[PDB]
Amino acid sequence: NFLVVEGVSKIYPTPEGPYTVLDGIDLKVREGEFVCLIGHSGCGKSTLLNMISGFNTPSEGVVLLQDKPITEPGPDRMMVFQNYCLLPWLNVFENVYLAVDAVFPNKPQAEKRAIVREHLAMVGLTEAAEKKPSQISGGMKQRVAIARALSIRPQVLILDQPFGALDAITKEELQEELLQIWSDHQVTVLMITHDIDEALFLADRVVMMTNGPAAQIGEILDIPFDRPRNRRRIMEDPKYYDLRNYALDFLFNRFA
Amino acid sequence: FLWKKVVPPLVALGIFLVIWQLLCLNPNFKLPGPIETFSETWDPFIINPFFDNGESDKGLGWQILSSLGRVGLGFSLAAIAGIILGILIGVNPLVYNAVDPIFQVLRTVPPLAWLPISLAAFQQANPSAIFVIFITSIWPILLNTTVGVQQIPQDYINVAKVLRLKGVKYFFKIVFPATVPYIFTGLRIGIGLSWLAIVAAEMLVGGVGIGSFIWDAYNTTTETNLSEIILALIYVGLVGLLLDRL
Amino acid sequence: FLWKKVVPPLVALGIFLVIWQLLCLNPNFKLPGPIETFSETWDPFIINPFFDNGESDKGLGWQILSSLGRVGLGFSLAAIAGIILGILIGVNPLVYNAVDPIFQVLRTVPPLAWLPISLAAFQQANPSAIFVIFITSIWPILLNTTVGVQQIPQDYINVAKVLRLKGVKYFFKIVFPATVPYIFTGLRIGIGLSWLAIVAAEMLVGGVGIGSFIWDAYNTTTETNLSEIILALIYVGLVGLLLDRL
Amino acid sequence: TFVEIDHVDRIFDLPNGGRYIALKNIELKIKQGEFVSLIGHSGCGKSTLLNIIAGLDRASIGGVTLEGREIREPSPDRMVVFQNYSLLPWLTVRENVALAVDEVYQGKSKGERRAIIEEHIDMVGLRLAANKRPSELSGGMKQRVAIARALATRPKLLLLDQPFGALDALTRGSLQEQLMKICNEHQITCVMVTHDVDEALLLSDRVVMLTNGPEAHIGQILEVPISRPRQRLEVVKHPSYYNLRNEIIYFLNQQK
Numbered sequence A: 001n002f003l004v005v006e007g008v009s010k011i012y013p014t015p016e017g018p019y020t021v022l023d024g025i026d027l028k029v030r031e032g033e034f035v036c037l038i039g040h041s042g043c044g045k046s047t048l049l050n051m052i053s054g055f056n057t058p059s060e061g062v063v064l065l066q067d068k069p070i071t072e073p074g075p076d077r078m079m080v081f082q083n084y085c086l087l088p089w090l091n092v093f094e095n096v097y098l099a100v101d102a103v104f105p106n107k108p109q110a111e112k113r114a115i116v117r118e119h120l121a122m123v124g125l126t127e128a129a130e131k132k133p134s135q136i137s138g139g140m141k142q143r144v145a146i147a148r149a150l151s152i153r154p155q156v157l158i159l160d161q162p163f164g165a166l167d168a169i170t171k172e173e174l175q176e177e178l179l180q181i182w183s184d185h186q187v188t189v190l191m192i193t194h195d196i197d198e199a200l201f202l203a204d205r206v207v208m209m210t211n212g213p214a215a216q217i218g219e220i221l222d223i224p225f226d227r228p229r230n231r232r233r234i235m236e237d238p239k240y241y242d243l244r245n246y247a248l249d250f251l252f253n254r255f256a
Numbered sequence B, C: 001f002l003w004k005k006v007v008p009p010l011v012a013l014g015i016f017l018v019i020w021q022l023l024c025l026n027p028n029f030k031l032p033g034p035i036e037t038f039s040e041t042w043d044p045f046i047i048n049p050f051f052d053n054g055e056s057d058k059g060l061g062w063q064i065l066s067s068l069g070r071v072g073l074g075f076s077l078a079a080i081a082g083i084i085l086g087i088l089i090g091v092n093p094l095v096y097n098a099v100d101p102i103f104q105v106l107r108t109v110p111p112l113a114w115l116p117i118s119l120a121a122f123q124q125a126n127p128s129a130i131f132v133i134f135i136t137s138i139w140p141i142l143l144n145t146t147v148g149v150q151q152i153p154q155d156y157i158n159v160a161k162v163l164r165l166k167g168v169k170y171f172f173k174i175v176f177p178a179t180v181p182y183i184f185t186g187l188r189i190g191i192g193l194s195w196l197a198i199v200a201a202e203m204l205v206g207g208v209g210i211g212s213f214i215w216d217a218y219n220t221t222t223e224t225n226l227s228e229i230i231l232a233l234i235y236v237g238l239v240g241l242l243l244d245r246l
Numbered sequence D: 001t002f003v004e005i006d007h008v009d010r011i012f013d014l015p016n017g018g019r020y021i022a023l024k025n026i027e028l029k030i031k032q033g034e035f036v037s038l039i040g041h042s043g044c045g046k047s048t049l050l051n052i053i054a055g056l057d058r059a060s061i062g063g064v065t066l067e068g069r070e071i072r073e074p075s076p077d078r079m080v081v082f083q084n085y086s087l088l089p090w091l092t093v094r095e096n097v098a099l100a101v102d103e104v105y106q107g108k109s110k111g112e113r114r115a116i117i118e119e120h121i122d123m124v125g126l127r128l129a130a131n132k133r134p135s136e137l138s139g140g141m142k143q144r145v146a147i148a149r150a151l152a153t154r155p156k157l158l159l160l161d162q163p164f165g166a167l168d169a170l171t172r173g174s175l176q177e178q179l180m181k182i183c184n185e186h187q188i189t190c191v192m193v194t195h196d197v198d199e200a201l202l203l204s205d206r207v208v209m210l211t212n213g214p215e216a217h218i219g220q221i222l223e224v225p226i227s228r229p230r231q232r233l234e235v236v237k238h239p240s241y242y243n244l245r246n247e248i249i250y251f252l253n254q255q256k
């Protein structure tokens, strides 16, 4: 109805033959949902979300957004890249300002400028607004990509491990901010996480993919918690500490 | 306090200026040394430039200035054409594959071979000299810009693909800042080639301009023959050095 | 199935071959068209190369091969000298700041201006022609290599610094693989300059070789004057195209 | 003592109208064979301090002493797992590890060197991708080969900068093992920068806790009184385990 993945697959031509990454993945993501895609390293989480963002054409399959095939990346499908693609010649302010000006140039300065300023303060890079990416740390590079994506406020958000290089305090702070902007708008978030505690706190549904070649979706879960999720209370519910080890069970079972 | 950026040029200038003199100790070495070169031409030329003796004997100040306006116009047109074409050729790999050979076969034509062809095309011989400068010092700018665009990292292109960065916005925000070393190196080589083809280009104009001064001094063998052209080359290099640092 | 790699060059070859004929419809355009250029020189030259009718009249195959052996030795020396130097001046920025000016002033010298200097230094005139080719087609190889080394990402340098990679091993494992687009682009431009100064270089040798054929056809005006030099340039371009893809 | 730090104080120029003090007055002594964690906030100076020990960065005032000799340049006995993984795109996974172990062990008959590369690939589980370039890997996959080439050299001092950030639950837990036993079997002292508290306690002997903001200094050097053989299961059962963990979260919260 909103975002349909219809039997997509990915074959990568290698000198040793054909390598299969994806095989028969089906998804039905409704508007405004939060989906966390977890799995092993090298199973195909980034490849699967690349097709939704338009960066990878499926070998056999099609991805539809509102009954429309996806073939080219757009600004309504903003992505947070796993490598934090930032332009080295721009500052933290200019990197975010590039996305703001490109997706809507109609309004003049001092209004789109304020959008950049508030998003830098949201991630906490207020002091780091005049330095190049070569002068900031890896975690600070991550927050520039987050601020760049959140400023556009796209129809659907695609995140590829957006909190990997952040400490516990900073990561938890950004999770709440991500949730706040997720509810105040109609943003659909497709998120990749390697932390089980992170996926359960944010996602409405948790999707796991099998490891190795020809990876398909296995044992999709639902997350039945009250919408205003808060820490120190979601762990208190009996629905926690059994969904979590269920995810750990699948991750450990996929080995060999 | 520039002790490592103004002194090493002078220290390095000490070499190739004294060993040049020692190279003349060999009797077979007919090339004049720095002492001979800077003394034979000292009286009429090094004493004062910008002197007029009628006809076309304008010393060296006007000769290097008259040719400066020729290479300046030729390089400016080639720099604009080379950069724009290189960006257009760098993108759209089908277009790069389309005109691949007719740019390669057209860039091996010597400026002396361009002299008769440009005469027939332009029957004024004033813009013919400009074309020789333009068509010679355009391939380093064109090739370096094309290779620079083709070598843009996918990370910057991915950022451009997500946003609606296409057309002039894509070139001015992604293509140009990324390919700065390639474009500027092509301009650096292009500057040298504008002066490298000034002797041939100014074969269709009067006796004023460096390149006509070099040509007629090479044809007429006198006692102060090699010294005159060597001093002219030094003037060209210094002018090309200021143009390089610009 | 080369439909987007061999076909577009010929489709793009149709343009600049028919508009070239259409440009001659203007009576002021004295340049011969493709039809007359390939017809006036058809009988003696295009029918069969490698015909010897006496000294300095060895058709066109020996002309394109005698010059090929001159640019081959000149470019090979310049390619080695430029790459080895470009790495050495590319690293050690103190050396780069040391000989910055003496290379800029020495690369604006036209090949025709190198002709009297080479004769004085080399009183044999056989290697002096090689020197003109060598000294002309060396700076793009030198300039691109220095820029490439200076633009090596710090990530690759960090890997080389943590390990004991320095000297020959650092050049063959980090400097060379990283600076492949820069070095090869300079070589491609260097190939063009070797043929760009072949007319000037062969001013000191016999009448055999392309460059002597261009020069003596430019000095003497005949009915098949412009057509002969245009055909010779086509042979140079095709040979340069084969050398470019190597 | 094995590696010691007197008074390192890092100042960055910030050419246009500023003077940033990343670090100041850091005193730290690490004994031989000791595993030290370097937890802290994102952008506080963990990598800058780690680089100074490695030699990639020069302290403005102060110095780092290793076995009685001053540190002034990078050396193979101080191999670093780079946060950006610093992979060479023109070399495969096997060749990237091969480049690391070819200069540390010159004169090894080229027969044992191949075995060293292959068995270190086994440890990180990249056998099915030893012929793939970094351009055709994933973020977690690129991280594993980065640590694979570091462990192949067997450094006297091992410097780790977020070595498990892009790994899932099983691989990170599996790669936490085969790292402490190398530190146990071989006399390897390790300095680790991590953002996961549950893994800092499992690996380290004492936890250095930097202070958020400019002019960062060492807050606490609290040590874990747990037996050296750890299997990640009984260490949690220790009553003191949670006491140290909440102490770590305590200082991280007060730096907000």
Ligand SMILES: Nc1ncnc2c1ncn2[C@@H]1O[C@H](COP(=O)(O)OP(=O)(O)OP(=O)(O)O)[C@@H](O)[C@H]1O
Pocket: A012, A019, A021, A039, A040, A041, A042, A043, A044, A045, A046, A047, A048, A082, D129, D132, D135, D136, D137, D138, D139, D140, D141, D166
């Ligand atoms: N261009 C490519 N060519 C060949 N194989 C590729 C290519 N891109 C990805 N792969 C392979 O696809 C598999 C999964 O890649 P992908 O980047 O989607 O992993 P992931 O599970 O999302 O990553 P992470 O390690 O961050 O969890 C890996 O085996 C990888 O080698």
Ligand SMILES: Nc1ncnc2c1ncn2[C@@H]1O[C@H](COP(=O)(O)OP(=O)(O)OP(=O)(O)O)[C@@H](O)[C@H]1O
Pocket: A128, A131, A134, A135, A136, A137, A138, A139, A140, A165, D012, D013, D014, D020, D022, D040, D041, D042, D043, D044, D045, D046, D047, D048, D049
């Ligand atoms: N060249 C530089 N110029 C200016 N400031 C710099 C420079 N290098 C680093 N900094 C700043 O100094 C601090 C040191 O950053 P560092 O990489 O050490 O942090 P970190 O704690 O390792 O980061 P993270 O946890 O995000 O990876 C940061 O605040 C950074 O912005």
Ligand SMILES: [Mg+2]
Pocket: A045, A046, A047, A082, A160, D138, D139, D140
């Ligand atoms: Mg990935």
Ligand SMILES: [Mg+2]
Pocket: A137, A138, A139, D046, D047, D048, D083
């Ligand atoms: Mg860091």
